[PDB]
């Protein structure tokens, strides 16, 4: 997903996963901003260990 | 053959326009490669875009640079080595290496050359009649006469990578008919667009990126499954997590329903 | 997660939607729902057979 | 390779075939047949034929060749009687004739381009 | 990594190259791109079906 890929790149670069930072990467890609989808995404990512989730999975 | 140029400043002048005509400029090593092999290798390049001349007349990339705005001086340490050419091309950097570096032709090693890789000689009958077996023994190849033929006792490494091959060593190997290396235009270097690439880059991984891609793909996939964020790939798994976890509470416990 | 369990629980009872139930369950939990997360789950749910997805386990 | 000399149409000469050794790796008049069949028209100037030997086979590397190709096209057997100026016989090859000789040569020749190949044959033709 | 996520994100949108997008996304991240890393990823990408590589997951 463009939104999931944007989150993993933002964490790899060392920058926080928020609405501004996702919006700038999303705009550079050329994909239109949709308020609901990045807002859910930041909310889903809230309270998470990105590192611990990333590795297990079937 | 006579004294007449044998040009100076004239062939440089043709060469001047040649770096400027083409985007991508390579610094390349013929030394090893035979010329049916080089000349064939060059046939490939030539259809696509072409190679031209120098000594120190080559090192004069500076004049070419001076005409434009690109390098001087500024380059890391001018990488040129014995036996260098320039390849001027349309062809992007990465592809040029795969043509040249992958497709090399074979040929024999040489006396006084540094071995590029480990050299071994096999055990079995040489097929040769009694004579100076001693020459083989001198190198540290054990041989003995079995069945009236010279045979090599065992497989062993005669020379390692990064050590020079002795003059005796080379000659004796050639008589055995043992060769083995890959020859073609070793790439020392690349210029494109203000950027300098050395040879480590130029062997261009790629399998590692597949693994990293698939792992990146799994990071995304993982994030997707666990997170619950339902565009096309993730969805059926995300629903399953909310069960995986219920079905699950049953297994440890000891209420039966 | 909150959302996943909430729609699953309703599915067992046999019925679900934005305001009527999803919002009601999470609100019964005492938690404030993010609209974007509800909207995303519902949009994903449309035209899906939840029972069939369960039948493979993963 | 270990090389040899030949005349058009020759077979079985004592001096040329016997001391140089009979290809086929034995049994001359194997090769003596093979060279002779191939050789073409009247003897003229000697050609190289070049010997390569394999297990119970002989093979020869024979180029009279691209110039013998010129002879066929022109319908003129000699070569340039009065060198580089003007030939005694009037063998002017056409431009269409020379690119077709170049087409056929292009495998044997290295040449990059067909236009490159036309120079190489033309340079041979003039002299 | 930065590079991997950036081309993946673009692939989801459906398009990519050196300056136009790869450079644009990482620059949108606020990070300075190493040219050698972009060049290596692109050279590797040529003649590859990204969608097929994804279909086995590893």
Cα–Cα distance measured from residue B19 to residue D17, given in angstroms and rounded to the nearest whole number: 56
Using left for φ > 0, alpha for ψ between -120 and 50, and beta otherwise, residue D114 falls in: alpha
Q: Is A56 exposed, middle or buried (0-12, 13-18, 19+ CB in 10 A)?
A: exposed
Resolution (A): 8.8
- Pick from B235, B243, B247: which is nearest to C44 by CB? B235
Cα–Cα distance measured from residue A26 to residue A20, given in angstroms and rounded to the nearest whole number: 10
Strand-by-strand arrangement of the B149-152 sheet: B124-125, B149-152, B143-146
Token pair for B26: 């390579």
User: Hey, how many other C-beta atoms are within 10 angstroms of the C-beta on D78?
Assistant: 13
Contact B192, B93 (CB under 8 A): yes
Neighbouring-strand partners of residue B86: B27, B52
Interface A–E counts its CB contacts (< 8 A) at 53
Rg of chain E over all Cα atoms, to the nearest angstrom: 11
Please tell me which residue of chain A has the smallest CA distance to C58: A58
- Cα torsion for B120, B121, B123, B127, to the nearest 10°? 170
Contact B73, B147 (CB under 8 A): no
**Chains E and C share 3 or more Cβ pairs within 8 Å:** no
User: Hey, how many other C-beta atoms are within 10 angstroms of the C-beta on D123?
Assistant: 9
Contact A11, B220 (CB under 8 A): no
CA end-to-end distance (rounded Å), chain D: 29
Cα–Cα distance measured from residue B49 to residue D112, given in angstroms and rounded to the nearest whole number: 11
What's the DSSP call for residue B166?
P
What element of type H or E holds B52? strand B51-52
Q: Which residues contact D5 (CB under 8 A, 6 or more apart)?
A: D16, D46, D48, D49
Cα–Cα distance measured from residue E45 to residue D70, given in angstroms and rounded to the nearest whole number: 51
Angle of CA points B160, B161, B164, to nearest 5°: 75
What's the DSSP call for residue B203?
S
Angle of CA points A32, A33, A34, to nearest 5°: 115
Residue given tokens 């997008």 in the structure block: E21
E53 touches chain B (CB under 8 A): yes
Q: Is B189 exposed, middle or buried (0-12, 13-18, 19+ CB in 10 A)?
A: buried
Query: Looking at CA atoms only, how far is residue D84 from chain B in angstroms?
Result: 20
- Cα torsion for A19, A21, A25, A31, to the nearest 10°? 10
Q: What are phi and psi of B119, to 5 degrees?
A: -110, 135
What element of type H or E holds E37? helix E35-45
Q: What is the sign, positive or negative, of the torsion defined by CA atoms of D75, D80, D82, D85?
A: positive
Cα–Cα distance measured from residue E10 to residue E20, given in angstroms and rounded to the nearest whole number: 11
Which whole-number Å values give the CA distances from B163 to B113, B116, B160, B177, in the listed order? 9, 8, 6, 21
Contacts of C57 in chain B (CB under 8 A): 240, 243-244, 247
Residue given tokens 């807002």 in the structure block: A39
| 3-class secondary-structure state, position B150 | strand
Q: Which residues contact B14 (CB under 8 A, 6 or more apart)?
A: B52
Half-sphere exposure of B44 (CA within 13 A, CB side): 17
Neighbouring-strand partners of residue E31: none
Which whole-number Å values give the CA distances from B154 to B122, B127, B161, B178, in the listed order? 6, 15, 20, 15
Buried b / exposed e along B42-58 (16+ C-beta atoms within 10 A): beebeeebebbebeeeb
Which whole-number Å values give the CA distances from A40 to B154, E19, E51, in the listed order? 70, 31, 26
Please tell me which residue of chain B has the smallest CA distance to A43: B227
Among residues D120, D73, D77, D127, the alpha carbon closest in space to that of D100 is found at D73
Beta-sheet pairing, B181-183 with B149-152 = unpaired
Which whole-number Å values give the CA distances from B101 to B29, B95, C51, E41, in the listed order? 11, 10, 56, 19
Among residues B44, B28, B184, B169, the alpha carbon closest in space to that of B106 is found at B184
Among residues E49, E19, E17, the alpha carbon closest in space to that of E33 is found at E19
Using left for φ > 0, alpha for ψ between -120 and 50, and beta otherwise, residue B75 falls in: beta
Q: Which residues contact B1 (CB under 8 A, 6 or more apart)?
A: none
- Pick from B92, B94, B213: which is nearest to E53 by CB? B213
Among residues B178, B81, B95, the alpha carbon closest in space to that of E46 is found at B95
**Dmax (CA) of chain E:** 33
Q: Which residues contact C24 (CB under 8 A, 6 or more apart)?
A: none
Query: Looking at CA atoms only, how far is residue B78 from chain E in angstroms?
Result: 19
One-character DSSP codes across chain D: -EE--B-TT----HHHHTTT--TTTS-TTSHHHHHHHH--S---S-B-EEEEEETTEEEEEE-S-THHHHHHHHT--S--SSTTT--SS-----HHHHHHHHHHHTTTS--SSHHHHHHHHHHHHH-
List residues of chain A with CB under 8 Å from any CB of chain E: 1-2, 5-6, 8-10, 12-13, 15, 21, 24-25, 27-31
Which whole-number Å values give the CA distances from B103 to B42, C55, D105, in the listed order? 12, 52, 26
What element of type H or E holds B238? helix B235-252
Q: Which residues contact B159 (CB under 8 A, 6 or more apart)?
A: B115, B118, B119, B165, B166, B169
Contact at CB, C8 and B229, closer than 8 angstroms: no
């Amino acid at each position: 997903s463009a939104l999931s890929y944007a989150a993993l790149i933002l964490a790899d670069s060392e920058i926080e996963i928020s609405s501004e930072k996702l919006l700038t990467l999303t705009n550079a890609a050329n994909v239109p901003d949709e308020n609901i989808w990045a807002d859910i995404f930041a909310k889903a990512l809230d309270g998470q260990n990105l590192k611990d989730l990333l590795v297990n999975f079937s | 053959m006579g004294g007449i140029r044998e040009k100076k400043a004239e062939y440089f002048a043709k060469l001047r326009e040649y770096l400027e005509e083409y985007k991508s400029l390579f610094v390349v090593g013929v030394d090893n490669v035979s010329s049916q092999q080089m000349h064939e290798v060059r046939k490939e390049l030539r259809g696509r875009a072409v190679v031209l001349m120098g000594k120190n007349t080559m090192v004069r990339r500076a004049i070419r640079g001076f005409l434009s705005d690109l390098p001087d001086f500024e380059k890391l340490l001018p990488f040129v080595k014995g036996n260098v050419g320039f390849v001027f091309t349309n062809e992007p950097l990465t592809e040029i290496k795969n043509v040249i570096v992958s497709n090399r032709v074979a040929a024999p090693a040489r006396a006084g050359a540094v071995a590029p890789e480990d050299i071994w000689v096999r055990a079995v009958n040489t097929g040769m009649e009694p004579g100076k077996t001693s020459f083989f023994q001198a190198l540290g190849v054990p041989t003995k006469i079995a069945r009236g033929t010279i045979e090599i006792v065992s497989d062993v490494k005669v020379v390692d990578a990064g050590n020079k091959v002795g003059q005796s060593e080379a000659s004796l190997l050639n008589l055995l008919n043992i060769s083995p290396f890959t020859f073609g235009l070793t790439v020392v270097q690349v210029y494109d667009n203000g950027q300098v690439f050395p040879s480590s880059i130029l062997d261009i991984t790629d399998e590692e990126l597949v693994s990293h891609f698939v792992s990146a793909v799994s990071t995304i996939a993982s994030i997707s499954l666990a997170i619950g964020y339902p565009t096309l790939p993730s969805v059926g798994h995300t629903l399953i997590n909310n069960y995986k976890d219920l079905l699950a509470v049953a297994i440890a416990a000891s209420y039966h329903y | 997660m909150k959302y996943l369990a909430a729609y699953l629980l309703l599915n067992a009872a046999g019925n679900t939607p934005d305001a009527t139930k999803i919002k009601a369950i999470l609100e019964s939990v005492g938690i404030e729902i993010e609209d974007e997360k509800v909207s995303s789950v519902l949009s994903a749910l449309e035209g899906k057979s939840v029972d069939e997805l369960i039948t493979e386990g993963n | 390779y270990l090389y040899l000399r030949a005349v058009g149409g020759e077979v079985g000469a004592s001096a040329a075939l016997a001391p140089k050794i009979g290809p086929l790796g034995l049994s001359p008049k194997k090769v003596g047949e093979d060279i002779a069949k191939a050789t073409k028209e009247f003897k003229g100037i000697k050609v190289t034929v070049q010997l390569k030997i394999q297990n119970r086979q002989a093979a020869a590397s024979v180029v009279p060749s691209a110039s013998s190709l010129v002879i066929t096209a022109l319908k003129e057997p000699p070569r340039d009687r009065k060198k580089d100026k003007n030939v005694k016989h009037s063998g002017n090859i056409q431009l269409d004739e020379i690119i077709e000789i170049a087409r056929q040569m292009r495998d044997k020749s290295f040449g990059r381009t067909l236009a490159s190949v036309t120079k190489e044959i033309l340079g041979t033709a003039q002299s």
